[PDB]
Structure 1
Amino acid sequence: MNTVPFTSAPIEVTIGIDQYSFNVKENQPFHGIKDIPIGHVHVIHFQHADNSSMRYGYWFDCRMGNFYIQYDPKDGLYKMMEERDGAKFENIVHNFKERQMMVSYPKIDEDDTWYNLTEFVQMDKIRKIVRKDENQFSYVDSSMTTVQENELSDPAHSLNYTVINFKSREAIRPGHEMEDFLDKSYYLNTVMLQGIFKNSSNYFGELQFAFLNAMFFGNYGSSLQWHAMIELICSSATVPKHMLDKLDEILYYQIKTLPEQYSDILLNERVWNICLYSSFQKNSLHNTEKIMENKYPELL
């Protein structure tokens, strides 16, 4: 189990750790989060009391270094930083753990929710989508636009998701226009899986990472990327059976975790109705369709 120490909490903030969250008051004796499960990526995220605008946060993996949060009063935010001095990091962590000034990551033992949401997400791929090479952790916020969004404006602060566009020459083989537009298997299996992603695990990792950024930061282009990646599979007549089975599990836990009150902005009626009821894969997502019909029948 690992630990993220906070130097201090000078401004009142709601703090998120993965799917959990808690309120810290202005100048409360808070010094961070302990008992974080090793083995998974994690995200720690913030929403100031005074300004609910800008949710923002850091993706990290504790196996990749010792990280802490320090509030910067010039830039006005909780910043993640790396401590190089290990022995000195152990001393600080040990001192606040003795004084019980840390919240415990509150995982229930029965609970595979975070594993299920992050099964294919890897820090190395996150850092290629979020380009800031001098740090081992990645910063994301509500307002960051995607590469494809900038094509339709600061490139250093963008989300470099894999561009998917159903009416593009990449997607459509000369002389197969109708075949490739109505059945996207060429685009999925040859262009994207074999050519770009290399395997379905990397594909599923980007898809999971886009959903999480949509849900935790309300990031619109992430939401667009998550639906586009679902639609590309649902609209392909030929998909490996193992990929359909895992997709159904993946979306099932995404739909289960989504706040009920955010469904109206995080779910695209057209894509979901198409995917569950009209597409080639309309009968292949048994768990996802059952949870969608019982939780959000309004959308359908």
Structure 2
Amino acid sequence: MNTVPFTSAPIEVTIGIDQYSFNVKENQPFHGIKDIPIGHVHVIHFQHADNSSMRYGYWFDCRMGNFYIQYDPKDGLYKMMEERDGAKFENIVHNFKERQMMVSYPKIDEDDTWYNLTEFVQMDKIRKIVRKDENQFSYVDSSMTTVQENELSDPAHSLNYTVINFKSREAIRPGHEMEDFLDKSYYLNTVMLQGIFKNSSNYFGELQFAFLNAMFFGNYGSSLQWHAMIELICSSATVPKHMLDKLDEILYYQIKTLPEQYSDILLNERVWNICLYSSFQKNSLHNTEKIMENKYPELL
């Protein structure tokens, strides 16, 4: 188990750790989060009580360093930092646990939810999407745009997701215009899987990361990316059977976790109706179709 200590909590804030969240009052004696599962990436995220504008947060992997949070009164946010002095850090964490000033990561033992949402997500791949190489953790917020959004503005503060565009020369082979537009298997299998992602694990990792950024920060470009990566699979007639079965599991857990009250803004009616009821894979997503029809029958 690992720990992310807080120097202090000077402003009232709602704090998220993965799919969990809790309220901290202004100047409350809060000094961090303990018992964080080793072996998974994690995200610690923030929404200030006085300005719900800008949800923001940090993706990190506790195996890559000792990280803590400290409020910066000049830039007005909780910042993640790395402590390179291992002995200083162990000393601090021990003092704060002895005084019980930390919340415990509240993982139920039956519960595989976080694993199921992050199965293919790797910190090394996050850091290529979110470029800030002097840190081992990655900052994301509600307003950050994607490289594709910037083509249609600061490049340093962008989400470099893989660009997917169904009406692009990359997606369409000369002489197969109709075939490649109506059946995207070429674009999925040769261009994207073999060419850019190298394997389906990296493709699913980006898909999962895009969803989580959409859900936790309301990041619109991330929601567009998540849907594009679903649509490209559903709109392909030829997809490896193991990818379809894994996609069904991935989407199932994503739909299961989504706040019921955010479904209106996080789910694209066109893509889902197309994917479940019109596409080549309309009969291949049994678990996802069942949870969608029982939970969000309005959208369909």
TM-score by length of 1: 1.00
In structure 2, the partner of 1:178 is 178
TM-score by length of 2: 1.00
Aligned-pair distance for 1:253? 0.1
Task: Provide structure 2 residue ranges, at least 5 long, that are not aligned to the other structure.
Answer: none
Q: Secondary structure at the match of 2:233?
A: helix
Distance 2:201 2:70 in 1: 35
Q: Secondary structure at the match of 1:57?
A: strand
Distance 1:266 1:86 in 2: 41
Distance 2:87 2:198 in 1: 40
State the identity %: 100
Aligned-pair distance for 1:54? 0.2
Distance 2:212 2:120 in 1: 12
Distance 2:229 2:168 in 1: 15
Aligned-pair distance for 1:195? 0.2
Aligned-pair distance for 1:101? 0.2
In structure 2, the partner of 1:187 is 187
Task: Provide structure 1 residue ranges, at least 5 long, that are not aligned to the other structure.
Answer: none
Aligned-pair distance for 1:32? 0.1
Q: Secondary structure at the match of 1:110?
A: coil
Aligned-pair distance for 1:209? 0.0
User: Number of aligned pairs?
Assistant: 300
Q: Secondary structure at the match of 1:139?
A: strand
Q: Secondary structure at the match of 1:15?
A: strand
In structure 2, the partner of 1:220 is 220
Aligned-pair distance for 1:120? 0.1
Aligned-pair distance for 1:98? 0.2
Cα-to-partner distance string for 1:155-184 (whole Å, 9 max, x where unaligned):
000000000000000000000000000000
Distance 1:124 1:174 in 2: 36
Q: Secondary structure at the match of 2:53?
A: coil
Cα-to-partner distance string for 1:57-81 (whole Å, 9 max, x where unaligned):
0000000000000000000000000
Aligned-pair distance for 1:244? 0.1
Aligned-pair distance for 1:134? 0.1
Q: Secondary structure at the match of 2:203?
A: helix
Distance 1:234 1:152 in 2: 25
Aligned-pair distance for 1:3? 0.1
Aligned-pair distance for 1:264? 0.1
Q: Secondary structure at the match of 1:14?
A: strand
Q: Secondary structure at the match of 2:209?
A: helix
Cα-to-partner distance string for 1:22-77 (whole Å, 9 max, x where unaligned):
00000000000000000000000000000000000000000000000000000000
Distance 1:70 1:14 in 2: 15
Distance 1:220 1:73 in 2: 28
Q: Secondary structure at the match of 1:90?
A: helix
Cα-to-partner distance string for 1:249-274 (whole Å, 9 max, x where unaligned):
00000000000000000000000000
Q: Secondary structure at the match of 1:225?
A: helix
Aligned-pair distance for 1:200? 0.0
Distance 1:27 1:89 in 2: 22
Aligned-pair distance for 1:141? 0.1
Distance 2:220 2:242 in 1: 30
In structure 2, the partner of 1:47 is 47
Q: Secondary structure at the match of 2:156?
A: helix
Distance 2:60 2:216 in 1: 15
Cα-to-partner distance string for 1:112-149 (whole Å, 9 max, x where unaligned):
00000000000000000000000000000000000000
Distance 2:277 2:294 in 1: 15
Distance 2:292 2:121 in 1: 24
Cα-to-partner distance string for 1:236-256 (whole Å, 9 max, x where unaligned):
000000000000000000000
Aligned-pair distance for 1:206? 0.1
Aligned-pair distance for 1:152? 0.2
Aligned-pair distance for 1:196? 0.1
Aligned-pair distance for 1:10? 0.1
Aligned-pair distance for 1:107? 0.3
Cα-to-partner distance string for 1:72-92 (whole Å, 9 max, x where unaligned):
000000000000000110000
